[PDB]
Amino acid sequence: SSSIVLMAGDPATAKAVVVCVANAAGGPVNFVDMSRAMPEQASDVAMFGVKLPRTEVDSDGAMLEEVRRLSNAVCDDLLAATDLPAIVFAQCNGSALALAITRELVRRSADVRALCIGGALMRTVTGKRDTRTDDEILAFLGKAGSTLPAQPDEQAFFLHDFRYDGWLADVYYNHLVDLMSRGALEVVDIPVWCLVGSEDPLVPNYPVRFQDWSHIGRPVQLVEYAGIGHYLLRDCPEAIARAVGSVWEHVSC
Ligand code: NA
């Protein structure tokens, strides 16, 4: 019934915690390999994965309400589990919920010290809804290098969850763009790391656009993973665990 799951370390002995939001259509399972690397690459950091219930909602307003509910539930469970300094991690579309979680942690005066986002850039314009067909999505994801299920059952579940996560992230970022249009989005004094595979085709012009994360927090740091595409949790999970360890090192004081 908890919104989070302990995947590595032990909060009774750790020096910090990282709470992790999965890529589109993903969940804690997508972090298994990364978690297995944490004791070696990030010894002092315990790791929680966020469960994505994909609560049914009937409007953009209800989706935003759901983002708030889910982020609040994650903060509830995290702070109930640990007082340790916290790093928030997200891959790709999970960035939306990660931002919400980070902002709520800041609102609660929790000891949140960094935001680390893989394979995503800040959105500064109202987005476009996804009207592609299922075959169009699968062709696009295949070209981008995604892993895709072969069983039609798994394909249907994947496409449902992918469409849901894209809707959630579009609604949340559109909300942030609205706030920014009124000067109502406060930058938080939380450093931001943007981790990008140099061959990632979904973050165009990231060497310049990564700095847009400064609408969220500051300072902003870019780290490039040469030879890697968009799927950092699949193709260099040890490197991302190490990235979390490095963040902790940077914010440990
Ligand atoms: Na990935």
Numbering used by the authors: 2727 to 2979
What does the paper say about this structure?
The large, multidomain NRPSs operate through an assembly line strategy in which the growing peptide is tethered to carrier domains that deliver the intermediates to neighboring catalytic domains. The paradigm monobactam antibiotic sulfazecin is produced through the activity of a terminal thioesterase domain of SulM, which catalyzes an unusual β-lactam–forming reaction in which the nitrogen of the C-terminal N-sulfo-2,3-diaminopropionate residue attacks its thioester tether to release the monobactam product. We have determined the structure of the thioesterase domain as both a free-standing domain and a didomain complex with the upstream holo peptidyl-carrier domain.
The structure of the optimized genetically truncated thioesterase domain, which we refer to as SulTE, was determined. The protein has a typical α/β hydrolase fold with seven central β strands (β2 to β8) flanked by four α helices on one side and three helices on another side. The first strand of the canonical α/β hydrolase fold is missing and hence the structure starts with the second β-strand, which is anti-parallel to the remaining six strands. The active site residues of the SulM thioesterase domain, Cys2818, Asp2926, and His2956, form the catalytic triad where the central histidine is 3.2 Å and 2.7 Å from the cysteine and aspartic acid residues, respectively. The nucleophile Cys2818 is present at the turn following the β5 strand, while Asp2926 is located on the loop that follows the β7 strand and His2956 is positioned on the loop after β8 strand. Unlike the position of the aspartic acid residue on β6 (position I) seen in other NRPS TE domains, only ObiF1 (39) and SulTE reposition the aspartic acid residue to the loop following strand β7 referred as position II. In the SulTE structure, the loop that follows the β7 strand runs from Gly2923 to Val2946 and contains an unusually long α-310 composite helix. The first two residues of this helix, Tyr2932 and Pro2933, adopt a traditional α-helical conformation while the following nine residues form a 310 helix.
